């Protein structure tokens, strides 16, 4: 499967480009989808190449991109009628079919999340600038939704985050904190015994030791619950 | 070692026999007021025989000691408990149990 | 976007391509109060000078449009 | 008493020469009791008719895909009921009892029709892609029901409806099903004769396992004939290239491949019976 | 407080997510969970929860799940899981049954009556919490069950008479709160059986005249559906218990009446319809068409079942309430919408729902009614742990006990009737789906979809029919690990070898791409190594590869004693056309040097397996010579079978193996004393391959071969009178003497 | 076996090589080419059997140059040729 041009000259006569209907069904869809997959990719390198230690840190374009970002993978919403909802969620599902396929940004979108060596958020802020260091719940929360959305439709890539164990253990915190993305994991899909089994005996112990120390969120027992019987195939199994 | 603190008299020598069952209504605490178990809200009550190990060492003893009819006030030190791994779920890891039983009939 | 045309530094044009949309007269300025769209235009009416015109963006989606805002750079009265 | 095999013998009397006074109840009679017109609301759509619910769930549930098509009996039964409620089909009067025949039957499949069923019965094709099951047999002889002598609305309807919503995998689907159907396939047959001693001695099973399925590939080209019946053109010509939708095929020339087929396979059965004197009735039934 | 929180926040959504966190923990049955929480909730404690009027409704929902998921959850999904199932036994109170109740014969009560289906068994246990076990089974005990049955429908009493009232203030919130867990708490005991006698009637007496005349929300209708589909299904198992009353009287009936006429050339010889044709061919020809004078007793049953009915029952009040539900208003959650339509369609095709309940239905003696419902206790048990990693113990446990059942060799139509088949297929598909290394190796699964399944059922061209159907899924995944090949090589494989073991018409529905794909996994093994049992990696053990591939086509392509000419020549063009062995006699060809292939395991046989190579290519030529075209058995003029004949005499190398076959390793192994070595050496029975493929292929069509050969096993010939000491070669070289019936010819 | 770009952190490092490679790659198209013309007044036209139009993939911005080895291995937006990014495309028949 993996060839190469070369012919110098004249190569193989029996050999020609067949196109392929671009044009429609993808269409502007996939246009946006590729344009926009380049401009996070270019914006969040050029981030992150500057967020190497402390010209400045932009901010005001961090929150447009991310404020564009969490209007593009929107839930369809209830209130609307069955086809135009169905529409709607398949056109969802090939963007983010498309976005994990392609350039994956969600493996670099966690080393964006990796920074959390300011654990202050006063020090760093002011040692790198001015204000950020708190929008970091928006990132969290709107790409922990991104990638439950993501897994949601036909079990995309469920072994893919469960493969990141040691960055589950680093998303098992309890440090200005939001549960979503386990929770959300927890909920979407089993898929392989791991996403259901490598939550060990530590991992849960942790888990109660968040529930303790912190006080009654009443979101915890919501993942406790999907961490039992998850679609109904955890009949013993 | 038992510590019983008899509430209400009983027969004053009736002691249970090696092949007999004590008919109790106990409901048995937790330090700290926490009601772990109770057997008089079942409406149904306790049969054991004494000697074949099918209660715990420290219920055993303590029938031992209260007369027919003898309503009691039992506790549990650690050492006649469910052990330092505990009962699972229900009884925490090295703690104490206070009983009250009232021994019913004896057959 | 600076367009010279030297074969080595090639320009962009789905930024910049534009697609108009239904123009109006002054005088139809709509906004009786209130008003969805409910357009009353057949289309393909050819845009005649002083008609009130719309821009969108055949990639961004969006319309142009002059913001509330200021500043931009720039030290005047001017949007 | 112990292997009283009775309780499953009765099972062949009871399952089809008692269904017959069943099958001639209901049908039509619920299908007219459960749409009295607009119900009774005593109040704009008038709550909507409840078979309208029913098509209306049915086509929704065909538009949830799965890439795989389920075996829901609901399907089964109530595709029959419309089929048995739309086909309540010597010398009469030529021109009053024929047409009072044909107004009959153009009123039963407006009432079906009326309520969105030509979109359930194309949505239900497009989803299986070429999967030869029930389901696909079941709305199929829905659809021959509902096009029985070539109404022009239904046509009209399942025209606009392919243009507007460019379903390519419709098309794609039925020539999935047409390249699935089955043949006579002598060597089926040559194994089938030489069966326990001579002929179905051990009669465990009396599967044809020869011609497969004809009753649903005569239910298909029947379909597609009553697509086209009238001479409405309109279909032959979308039918031949779709040039609405970005891929083209040609059901007209796999409808030719077929004939091929079937016309090989019955020139090799012949030239089999060749040179023999006597036409046994198994050769006679696959024949026929 | 409690009734506090009906105005506080941030507590009830707590303490409702807590109860929804204890009723999930103890899901979908289970032992520890389920008695460690009946110690923070008790009875009482639920009682007095279940009764208070002014309790919010987030908390009424949450305490009657708990309560339904800890005390009443496990014996109720059994009967929901065992409902279609209409095993009924024999007994003097069986037959007793009456389809109608009296001659007034109007509807009848649907619950009110006598049933005698096999049921599972009824045990709960006590908490203790001062014992020993009580935990294994016997699930979260007994809540009381006299004071449920009559609290219940005292405050649903309460409940309808607040509804007909139609008050602005219900128990809970909306009306949801106050009717969605009394009908679910009711449903679930309806479904436990426990409402029986004047309670049911006294049940109908209120929901009848009933609480369907008023207005309803979505759940209630739903769960009122479920109501009704349940006393349908009870009217099912009323009408399937009467035919079995008829189907016992009149076969016994007809059983003296086919009896007495046995004899009493002739009309036909009667077919031997009396004798040898008294099977299911004689129930299909013994029909009430036109057949003596039993036939009216037939007949008015026929009319007594198909009355429409058991319009004049429960039928026509359910028709039209729906259609009034329909009516109303249009109809949201699709799963209500399609629970209707069924429901709707249930009642206009009762014959529909007869002859689906026909089939599964089964007359069990009352001998083994024990023995029975035993065997059901451990289906049940298996369904439950259906679709682990320490579960697999209670599975091979269950297993286990089935094996030992008089019930499964007795009644193998039972067996296949209960469908284990799809539970065992399931249970293996989620077992080894997944790739990488099947993580829970233990292959029971396999043993039990073979051994006395397709075994002591002896198929009755049903099982192994039925068995058939999954055959490419068991050749596909040829995993490893069973011990029945010894070692590993093949799990599946056995049970494809007895899916097709003796059933000729089988081995002819076999198609040609099952057999391409098999001649392409045995292809697939072309290599060769000198480690002692490897297969990728890690030499550690020194004690079959194709050959397990070339046992299975040999049983797909010989059936009794005949050999299939449609398979053989697939398989034979197949096996020419892609080389397998690598034969060093023939060193430029593909393989099959048979002259050089032997001697070399033989000396490579005491050398640092064994027996592995030889066994291999033994199987390759017995597979050959059973391949080969019955030498003028059926048919000797011509077509297809000298073009086979000359095909495998040309592998000139194959027309001489006297050199092999009569070959002197004979070994007398045990001699005078010791030395049996049954692991390595070649077997007795390892040149009835080569006998095989002679009298197969070329056989002694003149005397001057005998002759030229003079004894046959000569050198075994000398071992055999050496052996006038026994327990060694003498044991099967017997055998192998015997099957060397070639002399007499 | 379209032509595609590598990705997986291999792109945007090495970021030249073309792999004339297909599969899944196909349907979840990574693989895909936007094509812009020299004219800027009526740029999209129908376009006849033979004009030259630069191209750009969709992902990385590296736009399609040829090298002098008679093979592409891209080039960069800011960098490219004159002859060897026209593309111009080729009608049924060969030899000009």
Excluded at chain 5, 144 to 150: E, F, Q, T, V
């Amino acid at each position: 499967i993996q060839r190469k041009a070369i012919m110098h000259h004249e190569g193989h006569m029996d050999d020609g480009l067949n196109l392929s209907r671009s044009q429609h069904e993808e269409s502007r869809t996939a246009r946006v989808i590729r344009s926009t997959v380049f401009l996070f990719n270019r914006f969040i390198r050029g981030l992150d190449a500057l967020s190497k230690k402390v010209i400045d840190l932009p901010i005001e374009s961090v929150s447009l991109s991310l404020q564009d970002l969490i209007g593009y993978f929107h839930p369809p919403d209830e209130h609307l009628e069955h086809e135009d909802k169905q529409n709607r969620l398949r056109a969802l599902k090939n963007r983010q079919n498309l976005f994990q396929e392609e350039g994956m940004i969600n493996l670099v979108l966690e080393c964006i999340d990796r920074l959390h060596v300011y654990s202050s958020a006063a020090h760093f802020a002011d040692v790198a600038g001015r204000e950020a260091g708190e929008s970091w719940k928006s990132i969290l929360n709107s790409l922990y939704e991104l990638l439950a959305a993501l897994i949601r439709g036909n079990r995309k890539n469920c072994a893919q985050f469960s493969g990141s164990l040691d960055w589950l253990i680093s998303r098992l915190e309890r440090l200005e904190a939001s549960s979503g993305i386990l929770e959300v994991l927890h909920c979407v899909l089993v898929e392989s015994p791991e996403a259901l089994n490598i939550i060990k005996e530590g991992h849960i112990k942790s888990i109660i030791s968040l529930l303790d120390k912190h006080g009654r969120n009443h979101k915890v027992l919501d993942v406790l619950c999907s961490l039992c019987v998850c679609h109904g195939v955890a009949v013993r199994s | 070692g038992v510590e019983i603190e008899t509430i209400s008299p009983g027969d004053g020598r009736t002691f249970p026999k090696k092949g007999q069952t004590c008919v109790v209504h106990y409901t048995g605490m937790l330090q700290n007021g926490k009601k772990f178990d109770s057997s008089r809200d079942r409406n149904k009550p306790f049969k054991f025989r004494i000697g074949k190990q099918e209660v715990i060492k420290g219920f055993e003893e303590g029938a031992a000691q209260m007369s027919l009819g003898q309503r009691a006030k039992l506790t549990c030190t650690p050492d006649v408990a469910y052990g330092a791994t505990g009962h699972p779920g229900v009884i925490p890891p090295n703690a104490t149990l206070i009983f009250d039983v009232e021994l019913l009939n004896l057959e | 976007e600076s367009t010279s045309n030297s074969k080595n530094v090639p320009p962009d044009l789905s930024i910049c391509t534009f697609v108009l949309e239904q123009s109006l007269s002054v005088r139809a300025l709509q906004e009786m109060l209130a008003n969805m769209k409910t357009a009353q235009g057949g289309g393909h009416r050819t845009l005649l000078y002083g008609h009130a015109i719309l821009l969108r963006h055949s990639y961004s989606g969006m319309y142009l449009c002059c913001l509330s805002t200021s500043r931009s750079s720039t030290d005047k009265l001017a949007f | 008493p112990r292997h009283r095999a009775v309780n499953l013998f009765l099972q062949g009397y009871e399952k089809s020469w008692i269904e017959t006074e069943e099958h001639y109840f209901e049908d039509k009679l619920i299908e007219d009791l459960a749409k009295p017109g607009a119900e009774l609301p005593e109040e704009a759509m008038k709550r909507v008719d409840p078979l309208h619910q029913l098509i209306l769930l049915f086509s929704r549930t065909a538009l949830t895909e799965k890439c795989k098509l389920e075996e829901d009996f609901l399907y089964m039964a109530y595709a029959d009921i419309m089929a048995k409620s739309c086909h309540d089909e010597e010398e009469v009067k030529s021109f009053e009892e024929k047409e009072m025949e044909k107004q009959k039957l153009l009123y039963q499949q407006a009432r079906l029709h009326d309520r969105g069923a030509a979109e359930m019965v194309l949505q239900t094709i497009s989803a299986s892609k070429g999967e030869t099951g029930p389901m696909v047999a079941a709305t199929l002889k829905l659809g021959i029901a509902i096009l029985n002598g070539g109404n022009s609305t239904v046509q009209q309807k399942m025209l606009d409806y392919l243009k507007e919503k460019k379903d390519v995998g419709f098309f794609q689907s039925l020539a999935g099903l047409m390249q699935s159907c089955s043949v006579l396939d002598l060597n089926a047959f040559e194994r089938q004769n030489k069966a326990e001693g001579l002929g179905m001695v051990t009669e465990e099973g009396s599967g044809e396992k020869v011609l497969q399925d004809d009753e649903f590939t005569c239910d298909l080209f029947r379909f597609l004939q009553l697509l086209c019946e009238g001479h409405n053109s309109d279909f032959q010509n979308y039918l031949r290239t779709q040039t609405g939708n970005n891929t083209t095929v040609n059901i007209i020339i796999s409808t030719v491949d077929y004939l091929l087929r079937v016309q090989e396979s019955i020139s090799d059965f012949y030239w089999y019976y060749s040179g023999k004197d006597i036409i046994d009735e198994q050769g006679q039934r696959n024949f026929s | 407080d409690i009734l506090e929180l009906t105005e506080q926040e941030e507590l009830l959504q707590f303490h409702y997510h807590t109860l929804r966190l204890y009723s999930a923990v103890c899901a979908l049955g289970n032992h520890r969970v389920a008695h460690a929480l009946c110690s923070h909730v008790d009875e009482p404690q639920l009682l007095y929860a279940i009764e208070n009027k002014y309790m919010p409704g987030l908390l009424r929902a949450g305490y009657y799940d708990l309560l339904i998921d800890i005390h009443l959850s496990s014996y109720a999904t059994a009967r929901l899981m065992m409902n279609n199932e209409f095993i009924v036994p024999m007994t003097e109170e069986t037959k007793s049954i009456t389809l109608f109740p009296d001659e007034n014969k109007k509807h009848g009560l649907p619950g009110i009556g006598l049933s005698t289906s096999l049921r599972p068994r009824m045990r709960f246990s006590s908490p203790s919490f001062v014992s020993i076990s009580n935990d294994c089974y016997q699930y979260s005990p007994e809540f009381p069950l006299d004071i449920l049955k009559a609290k219940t429908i005292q405050m649903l009493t309460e409940a309808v008479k607040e509804g007909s009232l139609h008050a602005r203030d219900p128990v809970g919130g909306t009306t949801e709160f106050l009717f969605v867990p009394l009908i679910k708490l009711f449903y679930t005991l309806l479904i436990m059986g426990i409402f029986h006698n004047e309670d049911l009637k006294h049940i109908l007496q209120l929901i009848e005249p009933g609480l369907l005349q008023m207005k309803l929300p979505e759940p209630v209708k739903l769960q009122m559906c479920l109501l009704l589909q349940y006393l349908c299904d009870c009217q099912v198992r009323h009408r399937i218990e009467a035919i079995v009353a008829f189907s016992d009287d009149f076969v016994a009936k007809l059983q003296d009446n086919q009896r007495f006429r046995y004899n009493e050339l002739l009309d036909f010889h009667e077919d031997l319809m009396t004798h040898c044709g008294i099977e299911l061919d004689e129930d299909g020809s013994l029909d009430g068409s036109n057949d003596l004078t039993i036939r009216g007793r037939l007949l008015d049953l026929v009319e007594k079942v198909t009355y429409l009915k058991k319009c004049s029952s429960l039928q026509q009040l359910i028709s039209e309430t729906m259609v009034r539900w329909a009516q109303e208003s249009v109809i949201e959650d699709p799963e209500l919408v399609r629970a209707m339509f069924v429901l709707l369609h249930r009642q206009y095709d009762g014959i529909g729902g007869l002859v689906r309940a026909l089939p599964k239905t089964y007359t069990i003696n009352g001998v083994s009614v024990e023995d029975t419902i035993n065997l059901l206790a451990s289906l049940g048990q298996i369904r439950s742990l259906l679709s682990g990693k320490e579960e697999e113990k209670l599975m091979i446990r269950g297993l286990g006990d089935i094996m030992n059942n008089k019930v499964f060799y007795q009644h193998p139509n039972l067996m296949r009737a209960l469908g284990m088949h799809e539970t065992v297929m399931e249970v293996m598909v989620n077992v080894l789906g997944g790739g990488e290394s099947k993580e829970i190796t233990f292959p029971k699964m396999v043993a039990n979809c073979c051994r006395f399944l397709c075994y002591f059922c002896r198929i009755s061209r049903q099982n192994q029919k039925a068995m058939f159907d999954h055959l490419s899924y068991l050749l596909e995944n040829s995993s490893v690990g069973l011990a029945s090949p010894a070692m590993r090589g093949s799990t599946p494989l056995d049970v494809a070898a007895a899916s097709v073991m003796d059933n000729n018409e089988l081995a002819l529905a076999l198609r040609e791409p099952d057999l391409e794909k098999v001649v392409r996994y045995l292809a697939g093994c072309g290599l060769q190594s000198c480690q002692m049992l490897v297969s990728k990696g890690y030499p550690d053990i020194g004690w079959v590869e194709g050959e397990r591939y070339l046992d299975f086509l040999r049983f797909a392509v010989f059936c009794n004693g005949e050999s299939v000419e449609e398979n053989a020549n697939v398989v034979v063009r197949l096996l020419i056309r892609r080389p397998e062995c690598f034969g060093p006699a023939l060193r430029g060809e593909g393989g099959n040097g048979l002259l050089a292939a032997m001697e070399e395991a033989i000396k490579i046989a005491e050398d640092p397996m064994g027996n592995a190579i030889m066994t291999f290519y033994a199987a390759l030529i017995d597979l050959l010579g059973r391949c080969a075209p019955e030498m003028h058995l059926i048919h000797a003029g011509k077509g297809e079978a000298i073009r086979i004949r000359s095909i495998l005499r040309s592998l000139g190398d194959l027309v001489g193996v006297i050199s092999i076959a009569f070959q002197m390793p004979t070994i007398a192994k045990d001699g005078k004393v010791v030395e049996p070595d049954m692991s390595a050496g070649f077997c007795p029975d390892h040149k009835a391959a080569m006998v095989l493929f002679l009298d197969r292929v070329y056989g002694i069509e003149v005397q001057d071969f005998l002759l030229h050969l003079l004894e046959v096993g000569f050198l075994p010939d000398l071992r055999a009178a050496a052996s006038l000491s026994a327990t060694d070669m003498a044991l099967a070289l017997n055998r192998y003497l015997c099957t060397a019936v070639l002399p007499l010819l | 076996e379209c032509l595609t770009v590598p990705s997986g952190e291999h792109g945007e490092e090495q970021r030249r090589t073309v792999h004339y490679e297909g599969g899944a790659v196909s349907v979840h198209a990574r693989s895909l080419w936007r094509l812009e013309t020299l004219r800027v007044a009526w740029s999209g036209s129908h376009i006849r059997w033979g004009q030259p139009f630069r191209l750009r993939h969709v992902t990385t911005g590296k736009y399609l140059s040829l090298m002098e080895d008679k093979n592409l291995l891209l080039m960069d937006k800011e960098k490219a040729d004159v002859k060897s990014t026209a593309f111009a495309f080729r009608s049924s028949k060969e030899k000009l």
